[PDB]
DNA sequence: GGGACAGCGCGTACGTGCGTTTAAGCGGTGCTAGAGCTGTCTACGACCAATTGAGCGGCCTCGGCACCGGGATTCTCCAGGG
DNA sequence: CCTGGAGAATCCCGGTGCCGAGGCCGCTCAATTGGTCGTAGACAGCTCTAGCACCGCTTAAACGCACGTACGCGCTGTCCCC
């Protein structure tokens, strides 16, 4: 075999990178356009400071990572290694973020 | 030759972006349906924050949104961000 | 007297083409295509506007019927852009003078 | 309307007040010639002229784009046909409308290619 | 090689050749314009019948329009009206 | 030297698509147009524009039909187009009405 | 009310024998499994397009209930005309 | 025309579930039953367009000729032969 | 190796310039009326509660109606000269 790292094991290498580093894992410019787009629905004629966009990203990173960490415990309870939108929908309900 | 009004606004969060956040949670692999769901849960989360953020901005009678308004929105929502302070 | 007036939109189409692209020319034969295209679309929108008034017991035509006719003819992007252009035209008229 | 002033001949054309290109007086001139309705309000001629201008401008811009691909500075009816048959929204309109001295887009099917039921080829667009 | 040798024709028009003037190569180019790879031998006679039916329907309205105008010339304005009603509206002949 | 069947067809496909021409010979079409209208009305005169307009609509209708019949052939397993395809296409398109 | 916002939920469960009866009405005798899904899709696409004219006509009249007359106006615009439900 | 050439068009014997009636029990969506106002089209009065023709002068288009890119042969390599 | 399409030097298409023509787009007043802005009086449709037997909808299931599989030619495709 051409020394292909196992699909299960490639996560472990990716684990040690993100568990050791502090960074932002969402593209900035696509997020910049998305944040500017959702504003038009509620309030048009608006500008956006760079600090405001970064702060919105920082909340998003912690929101999803906390969702991912809690959803993993949902998967470990369901006897499956994989997380599923079944668990994510439950995670939003129990955390109170669904409504 | 040219495509229409816009693209990648909400689809700009591709599979690696979700996977990198998934690798942050410790998981190994995902089902394929998460990618549409993660974009959806991101959209509702931003909408809740951005609704509060523009509300402060409108009260300030300015057309620019600052991090202070975002912090105020996040602090009240239970998602307080201690960064980007004075 | 060869004074008979032919309502041709070639000059107006040419002026619009010049504004968007000063360096792009137009063939004489291709002018008739746009002129007939304008007349056909004009009849389509006017015909829809007339039918709307008859169905709604209305003896007048205003911007509302044209906006309704545009939505009944043009698809999504084309209708919303035409409506936006049409909405801006009537609003500016009330204040231009 | 008590408008006796310096100018009493022609202040501005009805289309020129807003800044439009297609005149609106001509549209209103013979609008009632066709028996569409009676007592036409002022909104309809302005709305109809504007939407016609938007449609006319879009076709011309796309025709110029197709003209540049063909190394021509003049809008040949082939350029107009390419614009019409390149957008699904524009495809529905003029579905069976014939364009004089125009043309049809260079479409081909896979089985016409030498390899039966296959159109892999090499780098050729579409 | 010399002379006609067979199949030669020096009889032009004279109540003939009106619809048979659309020879096999003429039909081929129309087929190639739409895009074909091979056409059967029966498509040539069928094409002439198909074209005639479409022309007959359009010209039937056109002559009716001309007679109402009390004129003998048939203009591009009369034929385009027939196409417009049928749905095959033709641009470029509006003047 | 010798072109095997199907080789020149592909080249001719890519040529006629980008061209602007009339594929029906001019002189036989004028005789055909006059004859069909001769029985409907005896004393008639034909303008040059009307003949050009009739040819373009007739050719484009046949060209559009050929495209549909080409897609009728791909529905079957035969590259060749038979009268089975044309007659079926006419019924679906509503021509036989 | 108004508790339903998104249209993700589908209530378009067309019945299979109804498709068989509709197909057999047109002369069909052997229906495959993949036919059923697209048969609903064709109906959905046709219903979507005809209803676009109905809402536009309804909004122009400032109505809350679509009348049969508005349907005839929408139907006759698209080439498929129904008789007896309007005029 | 004359052989090989690849599936898919019938029909088996057998599982899988959704289909149209039958009692019965809490609701739905139009029609009235009323009024108070918006739309909707009638009269006025000194004028505003935009239409209809006319003299002058300065401007726009097919013609030809230089280019540089597209049509022709003659070798270079991707197509079934050794 | 020719096949049959593609590249750099000669040759064909789009450009610029100048003349008098005689109608077109640009103002220019005349005259009766005519739409938008205010009121008019009359009835129509839109929301919420009532009566009493219908109607749609789900499981109770075991005989027959078709897509998957193997066979068999039988039609069509392509290569070769006048």
UniProtKB/Swiss-Prot annotation, chain B:
GO function term, MF aspect, one: structural constituent of chromatin
Residues the record lists as N6-methyllysine modifications: 4
Cross-linked residues, Glycyl lysine isopeptide (Lys-Gly) (interchain with G-Cter in UFM1): 15
Positions bearing Phosphoserine: 31
Post-translational modification as stated in the protein's UniProt record: Demethylation is performed by JMJD6.
Record PTM N6,N6,N6-trimethyllysine, positions in chain: 4
Modified residues annotated as N6-propionyllysine in this record: 15, 28, 61, 63, 75
Modified residues (N6-glutaryllysine): 15, 43, 61, 63, 75
Keywords: Acetylation, Chromosome, Citrullination, DNA-binding, Hydroxylation, Isopeptide bond, Methylation, Nucleosome core, Nucleus, Phosphoprotein, Ubl conjugation
Residues found modified as N6,N6-dimethyllysine: 4
N6-acetyllysine carried by residues: 15, 43, 63, 75
Signal sequence interval, chain numbering: none
Modified residues (N6-succinyllysine): 15, 61, 75
Protein name in the entry: Histone H4
Organism: Xenopus laevis
UniProtKB/Swiss-Prot annotation, chain C:
Glycyl lysine isopeptide (Lys-Gly) (interchain with G-Cter in ubiquitin) cross-link, renumbered residues: 92
Entry keyword set: Acetylation, Chromosome, DNA-binding, Glycoprotein, Isopeptide bond, Nucleosome core, Nucleus, Phosphoprotein, Ubl conjugation
Record's keyword annotation contains Disulfide bond: no
GO terms, molecular function: DNA binding; protein heterodimerization activity; structural constituent of chromatin
GO cellular component, one term: nucleosome
Chief location: nucleus
PTM text: Monoubiquitination of Lys-92 by BRE1 gives a specific tag for epigenetic transcriptional activation and is also prerequisite for histone H3 'Lys-4' and 'Lys-79' methylation.
Highest taxon in the source lineage: Eukaryota
Protein's cellular compartments: Nucleus; Chromosome
Function: Core component of nucleosome. Nucleosomes wrap and compact DNA into chromatin, limiting DNA accessibility to the cellular machineries which require DNA as a template. Histones thereby play a central role in transcription regulation, DNA repair, DNA replication and chromosomal stability. DNA accessibility is regulated via a complex set of post-translational modifications of histones, also called histone code, and nucleosome remodeling.
Entry similarity comment: Belongs to the histone H2B family.
Subunit text: The nucleosome is a histone octamer containing two molecules each of H2A, H2B, H3 and H4 assembled in one H3-H4 heterotetramer and two H2A-H2B heterodimers. The octamer wraps approximately 147 bp of DNA.
Descriptive protein name: Histone H2B 1.1
Lineage, broadest ranks: Eukaryota, Metazoa, Chordata, Craniata, Vertebrata
Covered range of the whole protein: 30 to 126 of 126
From Swiss-Prot, chain E:
Family: Belongs to the histone H4 family.
Listed name of the protein: Histone H4
Name of a matching Pfam family: CENP-T_C
DNA-binding annotation, residue ranges on this chain: 9-13
Modified residues (Phosphotyrosine): 44, 81
Entry-annotated residues carrying N6-succinyllysine: 24, 70, 84
Modified-residue entries (N6-(2-hydroxyisobutyryl)lysine), positions: 1, 5, 9, 24, 37, 52, 70, 72, 84
Record PTM Phosphoserine, positions in chain: 40
Residues where N6-propionyllysine is found: 1, 9, 24, 37, 70, 72, 84
Sequence positions bearing N6-acetyl-N6-methyllysine: 5
Sorted UniProt keywords: Acetylation, Chromosome, Citrullination, DNA-binding, Hydroxylation, Isopeptide bond, Methylation, Nucleosome core, Nucleus, Phosphoprotein, Ubl conjugation
Task of the protein: Core component of nucleosome. Nucleosomes wrap and compact DNA into chromatin, limiting DNA accessibility to the cellular machineries which require DNA as a template. Histones thereby play a central role in transcription regulation, DNA repair, DNA replication and chromosomal stability. DNA accessibility is regulated via a complex set of post-translational modifications of histones, also called histone code, and nucleosome remodeling.
Modified residues (N6-methylated lysine): 13
Post-translational modification: Demethylation is performed by JMJD6. Monomethylated, dimethylated or trimethylated at Lys-13 (H4K20me1, H4K20me2, H4K20me3). Monomethylation is performed by KMT5A/SET8. Trimethylation is performed by KMT5B and KMT5C and induces gene silencing. Monomethylated at Lys-5 (H4K12me1) by N6AMT1; H4K12me1 modification is present at the promoters of numerous genes encoding cell cycle regulators.
N6-acetyllysine found at: 1, 5, 9, 24, 52, 72, 84
SMART domains recorded: H4 (SM00417), TAF (SM00803)
